[PDB]
Amino acid sequence: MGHHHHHHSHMKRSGREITWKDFVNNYLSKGVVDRLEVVNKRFVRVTFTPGKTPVDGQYVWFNIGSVDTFERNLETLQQELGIEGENRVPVVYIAESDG
């Protein structure tokens, strides 16, 4: 049960640091990605579809720096891989001043 874990602990970034190319091939094109949550605009968390991996399943992430560059590449990437409205991966902008 992933319910009993360290709740009173800081978000250790997100999880495992991956590259954009690894993201595309092993996750994005496989449809196992639900959404891309851009946390504090520093990086993007690859959110897995609820069922594939739990919270304890340890989510993956990648640094972008240039949020603009991330978005241009993502929307191009989607139109290349034939992603239409249903497979379009929702981009959720996150920015807590705490981080």
UniProtKB/Swiss-Prot annotation:
Ubiquitous. Highly expressed in the cerebellar Purkinje cells. Upon import into the mitochondrion, the N-terminal transit peptide is cleaved to generate an intermediate form which undergoes autocatalytic proteolytic processing to generate the proteolytically active mature form. Residues 12-98 are mitochondrial intermembrane. Changing residue 39 to I: In SCA28; uncertain significance. Signal peptide: none annotated. It is found in: Mitochondrion inner membrane. It comes from the Eukaryota. Homohexamer. Forms heterohexamers with SPG7. The m-AAA protease is either composed of homohexamers of AFG3L2 or heterohexamers of AFG3L2 and SPG7. Interacts with MAIP1. Interacts with DNAJC19. Interacts with PHB2. It is linked to Spinocerebellar ataxia 28: Spinocerebellar ataxia is a clinically and genetically heterogeneous group of cerebellar disorders. Patients show progressive incoordination of gait and often poor coordination of hands, speech and eye movements, due to degeneration of the cerebellum with variable involvement of the brainstem and spinal cord. SCA28 is an autosomal dominant cerebellar ataxia (ADCA) with a slow progressive course and no evidence of sensory involvement or cognitive impairment. Spastic ataxia 5, autosomal recessive: A neurodegenerative disorder characterized by early onset spasticity, peripheral neuropathy, ptosis, oculomotor apraxia, dystonia, cerebellar atrophy, and progressive myoclonic epilepsy. In the N-terminal section; belongs to the AAA ATPase family. Catalytic component of the m-AAA protease, a protease that plays a key role in proteostasis of inner mitochondrial membrane proteins, and which is essential for axonal and neuron development. AFG3L2 possesses both ATPase and protease activities: the ATPase activity is required to unfold substrates, threading them into the internal proteolytic cavity for hydrolysis into small peptide fragments. The m-AAA protease carries out quality control in the inner membrane of the mitochondria by mediating degradation of mistranslated or misfolded polypeptides. This is Mitochondrial inner membrane m-AAA protease component AFG3L2. The lineage of its organism: Eukaryota, Metazoa, Chordata, Craniata, Vertebrata. The chain holds residues 164 to 251 of 797 of the full protein.
